[PDB]
Amino acid sequence: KVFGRCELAAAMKRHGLDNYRGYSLGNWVCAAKFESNFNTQATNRNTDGSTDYGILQINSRWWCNDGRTPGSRNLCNIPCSALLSSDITASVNCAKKIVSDGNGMNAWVAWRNRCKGTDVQAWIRGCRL
């Protein structure tokens, strides 16, 4: 799919993300524009060979099943391609957990620099929720 600004982000609050586990509502949609640019089908492999998947940019190395990453933990227990499709109804049970890791956003790279020290509510702003 291709999501709009106010249209790609109303479903997180549909998936337990409002102020979930220490992270506030303004702190989320920013990074989505920073990892696959509001696009779910944007997947990319890394120099490190762990293919990242989805708008989320998750590597096949630590989190999912692609078969080209051996010794991969695959803790999420879901085929990597189980996210990218138009319905992401389940894609978040893993991200909802990737934070309890005690690293939280430590996994995501874009935010820590592009959304860190930012005006996060400036992203959640103008939209009715």
Ligand SMILES: CC(=O)N[C@@H]1[C@@H](O)[C@H](O)[C@@H](CO)O[C@@H]1O
């Ligand atoms: C630049 C890029 O996409 N790198 C990814 C990052 O998105 C992801 O959070 C990380 C998890 O360990 O795998 C890679 O570092």
